[PDB]
Amino acid sequence: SLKLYGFSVSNYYNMVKLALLEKGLTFEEVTFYGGQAPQALEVSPRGKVPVLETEHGFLSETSVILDYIEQTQGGKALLPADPFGQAKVRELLKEIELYIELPARTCYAESFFGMSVEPLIKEKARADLLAGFATLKRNGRFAPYVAGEQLTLADLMFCFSVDLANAVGKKVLNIDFLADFPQAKALLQLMGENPHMPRILADKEASMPAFMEMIRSG
Amino acid sequence: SLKLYGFSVSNYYNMVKLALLEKGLTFEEVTFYGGQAPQALEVSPRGKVPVLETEHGFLSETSVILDYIEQTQGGKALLPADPFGQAKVRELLKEIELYIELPARTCYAESFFGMSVEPLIKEKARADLLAGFATLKRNGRFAPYVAGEQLTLADLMFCFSVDLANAVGKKVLNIDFLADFPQAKALLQLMGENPHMPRILADKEASMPAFMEMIRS
């Protein structure tokens, strides 16, 4: 009875999708690309993807959605038992989002759509990513997972942000962030071996041509 | 036994300060400006303010700190009891943070420190802010509070973000965002009358010369 609005090329969508799959929860996928059309803003108020549809209405923002899922749904816990530990997962998830994912996102135009980004935007992304990766190294436990010895929400934000950020690094900035961050390199391969990953990546590939056609027309 | 690390000119610090005061919680303030010095990064890993020191260690990020306080501390609830309602408060808080506070912050250099910002940065902030305010208008309930009829965490992010964003709008962009947002103008005046606001403001004024001095060197 949960519905997830988004598209399988979206990293933030894939984070929720993995959480639902990891938890063995039933959900229906609805193709939805967000954006600024008036009808789209009625579902997602800033036009972001994904959106969770519940009996009570829509929730947007991956971080918010994941917290609602933990609280309300059955299946494998994706948080530690203790309050401080939960806040530490959430601190790490937030850091990856604001200090790795968002700055990398400023360069997705160039890295994925072959459209060069302003030099001022590149400079800022390089400084922001260097700091974001430094923050993750300093604050992350990587034991092997981000926050410690168990898979948590922060590993979802890690595994679908750090891949894209490293692509931006190599293609746009001439920096391999993971070359000198072996903790992170090892976790990324580990998350790559999650039993639900083949389905996520298969759906992504299957969805890619429509996504690109949507881009091409708009 | 809780300690709050930060400085009274910081809007993120003041949000957590107001939460602690409103819940009647005991806390010590510790002057801390974050930043990129090695000893500061040992406290706050990205160098942001504020940081809460607990029995178990440090927590950074206002949104994270507020949630931790709500989960562990006594006093007046700043969230509704139901999980969907709580998520909606957090959605509203996140939206104010990401789509109003952060784009405004890109122009603080100009609005507050008299250092003119690049045209690219200015125009991006204008577009982000118009979109952030539109998002707040469409998603917020303002009944009279952001999320409905009771004060919640989202009102903390609202009252310490929208003020500075409107200052940015007027000074840097020649846009008065609140001029066509009567719900938000009324709520900002209401939050202004909170009995802890005089203390917050007076502490801010008292702390400004040391803050600016830290900046000059």
UniProtKB/TrEMBL annotation, chain B:
It comes from the Bacteria. Coiled coil: none annotated. Residues 82-211 form the GST C-terminal domain. Residues 2-77 form the GST N-terminal domain. The keyword Hydrolase does not apply. GO terms for cellular component: cytoplasm. Its EC number is 2.5.1.18. Glutathione binds at S10, K48, V49, T62, R105. Pfam families: GST_C, GST_N_3. It comes from Pseudomonas putida (strain ATCC 47054 / DSM 6125 / CFBP 8728 / NCIMB 11950 / KT2440). Keywords: Transferase. This is Glutathione S-transferase. GO terms for molecular function: glutathione transferase activity. The keyword Protein biosynthesis does not apply.
